[PDB]
Amino acid sequence: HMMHVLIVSDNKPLVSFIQNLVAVNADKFQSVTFDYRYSAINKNPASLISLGLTSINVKSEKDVAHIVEHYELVVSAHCKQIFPSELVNNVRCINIHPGLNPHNRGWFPQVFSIINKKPVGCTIHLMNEEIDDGAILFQKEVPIFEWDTSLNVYERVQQTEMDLLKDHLADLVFANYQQKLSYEKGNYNGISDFKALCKLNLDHIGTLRDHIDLLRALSHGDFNNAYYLRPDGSKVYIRLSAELVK
Amino acid sequence: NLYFQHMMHVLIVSDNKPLVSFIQNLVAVNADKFQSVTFDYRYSAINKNPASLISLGLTSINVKSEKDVAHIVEHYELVVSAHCKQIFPSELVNNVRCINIHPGLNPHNRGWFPQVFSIINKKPVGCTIHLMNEEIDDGAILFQKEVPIFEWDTSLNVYERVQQTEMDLLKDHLADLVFANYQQKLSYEKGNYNGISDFKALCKLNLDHIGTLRDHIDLLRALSHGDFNNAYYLRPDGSKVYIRLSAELVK
Numbered sequence A: 001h002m003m004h005v006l007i008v009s010d011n012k013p014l015v016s017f018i019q020n021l022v023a024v025n026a027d028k029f030q031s032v033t034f035d036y037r038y039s040a041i042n043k044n045p046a047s048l049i050s051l052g053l054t055s056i057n058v059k060s061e062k063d064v065a066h067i068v069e070h071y072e073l074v075v076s077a078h079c080k081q082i083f084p085s086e087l088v089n090n091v092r093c094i095n096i097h098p099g100l101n102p103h104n105r106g107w108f109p110q111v112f113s114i115i116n117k118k119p120v121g122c123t124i125h126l127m128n129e130e131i132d133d134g135a136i137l138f139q140k141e142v143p144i145f146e147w148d149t150s151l152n153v154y155e156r157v158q159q160t161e162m163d164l165l166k167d168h169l170a171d172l173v174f175a176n177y178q179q180k181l182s183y184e185k186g187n188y189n190g191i192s193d194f195k196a197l198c199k200l201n202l203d204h205i206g207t208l209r210d211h212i213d214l215l216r217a218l219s220h221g222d223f224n225n226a227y228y229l230r231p232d233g234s235k236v237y238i239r240l241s242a243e244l245v246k
Numbered sequence B: 001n002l003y004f005q006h007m008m009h010v011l012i013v014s015d016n017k018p019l020v021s022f023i024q025n026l027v028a029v030n031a032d033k034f035q036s037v038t039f040d041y042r043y044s045a046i047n048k049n050p051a052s053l054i055s056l057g058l059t060s061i062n063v064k065s066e067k068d069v070a071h072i073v074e075h076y077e078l079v080v081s082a083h084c085k086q087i088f089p090s091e092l093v094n095n096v097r098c099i100n101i102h103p104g105l106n107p108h109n110r111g112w113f114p115q116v117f118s119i120i121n122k123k124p125v126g127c128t129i130h131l132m133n134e135e136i137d138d139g140a141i142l143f144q145k146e147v148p149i150f151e152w153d154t155s156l157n158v159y160e161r162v163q164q165t166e167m168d169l170l171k172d173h174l175a176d177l178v179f180a181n182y183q184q185k186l187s188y189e190k191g192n193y194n195g196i197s198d199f200k201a202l203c204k205l206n207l208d209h210i211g212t213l214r215d216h217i218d219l220l221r222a223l224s225h226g227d228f229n230n231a232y233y234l235r236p237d238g239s240k241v242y243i244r245l246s247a248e249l250v251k
């Protein structure tokens, strides 16, 4: 372990997947040590404690200096914290993004893609000052079908993240890649745009197709996303399922 | 020349295990009222999945069989339809006191799945206990109770509330029905009947239909009832996408 890699992750499936990859690839990583941390802002990180992860604060000046001093590479695997410029500028940082940059950069890309029909998939990219913005190292589109909810597309994106990590984790550690730029401008969706979508307008006029697309975009297993307000301020949450039958 | 200080036979025809099982128990609990009444239970011949009814020891009857009609007219003083899948012929309803337990509020959305139609057309729903004539869900109202429909109700939500009201009416009125302790004034309000083919038509979604999100949500919640395959759209290659919606009140 001459080379120290930090995995900062708030996503148990990806953490579990990477730990297994490194275990079965011990020959490729004999001179590499991997530490795993979850991010300070995580509001239920108990599941990640089970896999030996402990909190790190990527916006603490103390932790940034320690990371910069100790680690050759930081991998963000759905890290809930924005890396400060002092981290991304002073150590090689690579993000695993559950969108196809530069389309629907930011929050819950597949929700926006079900509605706006822009591509989705996984992008592994160098991390710069801005969010889901740096040089593309590896990316792979995943198709969307008319019977998909957010959950269906998200599970598909996660299987593509895992496929790219299986093929490219060592490439990422040993910098065996080519930095690529998109010719397209793309777009960003923030947490406030998602809150916007969630507030249903029952008076909104449109096609059943558009309304079904909105509701399937906002349907994600047990999450309470799409709602309208009753007069008394109570909420009605709406979920939709779509099931293909040959 | 001296008074000592004969058996009524009631036939219950039913294709609904919850009702049958509930009525069987209700008879036991009112057994002090039914010293001289015996209840026989049968399910409909056309019943495609009778298993759970055969497990309660019910056997089939065919209300369109000349022979079965003769046996009923021969043997029973009263027939009660409790969610019976078969239409009674004129030869049964005209010759025997027949009473239907209907999960709608007559005369509104008579016929199939009344709460599905009510969620959409805002007509009332509930339970109606009525005399059976030759027409469907049409004879004189004996007892009925409306149940509310909420914005956040599916078909399943309204149906369960109707089932509770049906059980409440039977608790209060099963003896009353048997012993004709009721009033039976005719209504000249015809209302509206929905057939099975009207339900099947609602089920075929038009993705191009323009409306409010409210009206689209109301249609999909009306057509959502547990795991039933109701609402669908047709794909070019003939396949179907089934659509279900849930609505959950959170205070």
Ligand SMILES: Cc1cn([C@H]2C[C@H](O)[C@@H](COP(=O)(O)OP(=O)(O)O[C@H]3O[C@H](C)[C@@H](N)[C@H](O)[C@H]3O)O2)c(=O)[nH]c1=O
Binding pocket: A010, A011, A078, A079, A080, A081, A097, A098, A106, A107, A108, A109, A150, A154, A218, A219, A220, A223, A224, A225
């Ligand atoms: C919290 C929440 C999640 N979801 C669905 C949509 C999400 O895409 C999916 C996974 O949610 P999650 O919070 O694990 O999010 P992650 O899959 O970890 O990813 C999200 O945060 C990362 C820090 C960012 N790098 C991503 O761009 C962002 O989309 O679950 C909902 O439908 N509603 C919710 O309230």
Ligand SMILES: Cc1cn([C@H]2C[C@H](O)[C@@H](COP(=O)(O)OP(=O)(O)O[C@H]3O[C@H](C)[C@@H](N)[C@H](O)[C@H]3O)O2)c(=O)[nH]c1=O
Binding pocket: B015, B016, B082, B083, B084, B085, B103, B111, B112, B113, B114, B155, B159, B223, B224, B225, B228, B229, B230
């Ligand atoms: C078969 C079927 C049922 N349902 C829902 C809506 C219904 O109100 C509810 C219960 O229906 P049910 O037929 O399973 O059980 P019941 O309400 O007991 O209906 C019975 O007595 C009625 C007077 C007759 N119209 C029915 O043919 C007979 O089956 O289930 C659906 O949403 N879709 C369906 O295809």
Ligand code: NA
Binding pocket: B152, B153, B154, B157, B246, B247, B248, B249
């Ligand atoms: Na509901």
